[PDB]
A paper describes a structure:
LysM domains, which are frequently present as repetitive entities in both bacterial and plant proteins, are known to interact with carbohydrates containing N-acetylglucosamine (GlcNAc) moieties, such as chitin and peptidoglycan. Here, a structural study of the Thermus thermophilus NlpC/P60 endopeptidase containing two LysM domains is presented. Glycosidases, such as muraminidases and glucosaminidases, hydrolyze glycosidic bonds between carbo­hydrate units, while peptidases, such as amidases, l,d-endopeptidases, d,l-endopeptidases, l,d-carboxypeptidases and d,d-carboxypeptidases, hydrolyze amide bonds of the peptide stem at specific positions. d,l-Endopeptidases belonging to the papain-like peptidase superfamily possess an NlpC/P60 domain which is responsible for their catalytic activity. This domain is commonly associated with PGN-binding domains such as the SH3b domain, choline-binding domain or lysin motif (LysM).
We have also successfully solved the crystal structure of P60_2LysM without any ligand. By comparing the LysM domains in this structure with the LysM domains in the full-length P60_tth and the P60_2LysM–chitohexaose structures, we observe that binding of the carbohydrate triggers only minor structural rearrangements in the binding pocket. However, the relative positions of the two LysM domains differ significantly in the bound state compared with the unbound states. Our structural data reinforce this observation and clearly indicate that the two LysM domains in P60_tth are flexible despite being separated by a short linker of only four amino acids.
Numbering used by the authors: 16 to 114
The structure:
Amino acid sequence: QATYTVAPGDTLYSIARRYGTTVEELMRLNGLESFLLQPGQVLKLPSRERTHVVAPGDTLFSLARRYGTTVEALMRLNGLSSPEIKVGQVLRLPEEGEA
């Protein structure tokens, strides 16, 4: 779960612009009803897909266990047909709930 601390000068639209989301989505995920933002308030950010650059010694199993997902979900997300991975390969990572 990604969050963000509201800084002086921030607004729901100014933050939404940065992280490529909408004002409504920010309010919908935080349960807000007002456009007011207190400096220091913690806002929940819309989930963005994590990423991993395959390093020496990595396996799909180790990466899956590391990022709280499964080998199966990892391969599906990246359209893989075999478990082999190469050093330097960029993998899209499922969410920690196998999502």
